[PDB]
Design a protein around this ligand. Structure first.
Ligand SMILES: Cn1cc(Br)cc(N)c1=O
Ligand SMILES: [Cl-]
Length: 130
């Protein structure tokens, strides 16, 4: 129905706004673009599902997210990719891990404060109907 198309449009507007707020945060610059294989040629070898905020915007715009749960799986992937690729004790790795956890935590905190649970429940019920 349109009403269902209107629901998913509202979802996309909401997700673009959350993603924009994460992307303009200086802490998260490293997560804003895919990893350049020239800088890190073994990335694509270790990380099977690269994810970044640019890719998340592309996926919103392609109507790939029908729920905030599916969006948060991609945010979780940005975080777990960073924990897996940068696991060492050295400060460079610890800084990226802290920034990755802070991304996950910020996305979840914005969604806790600004997502209506009944809106998410509607999205989940339309998705389950398809
Ligand atoms: C996410 N990300 C980005 C860059 Br640039 C370099 C890394 N080692 C990494 O894990
Ligand atoms: Cl820095």
């Amino acid at each position: 129905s349109m009403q269902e198309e209107d629901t998913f449009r509202e979802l996309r507007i909401f997700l673009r706004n959350v993603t924009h707020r994460l992307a303009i945060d200086k802490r998260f610059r490293v997560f804003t673009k895919p990893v350049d294989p020239d800088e890190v040629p073994d990335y694509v070898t270790v990380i099977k599902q690269p994810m970044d905020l640019s890719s998340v915007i592309s996926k919103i715009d392609l109507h790939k997210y029908l729920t905030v749960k599916d969006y948060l799986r991609d945010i979780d992937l940005i975080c777990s990719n960073a924990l897996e690729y940068n696991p060492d004790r050295d400060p460079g790795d610890r800084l990226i891990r802290h920034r990755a956890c802070a991304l996950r935590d910020t996305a979840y905190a914005i969604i806790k404060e600004e997502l209506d649970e009944d809106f998410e429940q509607l999205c989940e019920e339309i998705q389950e109907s398809r």
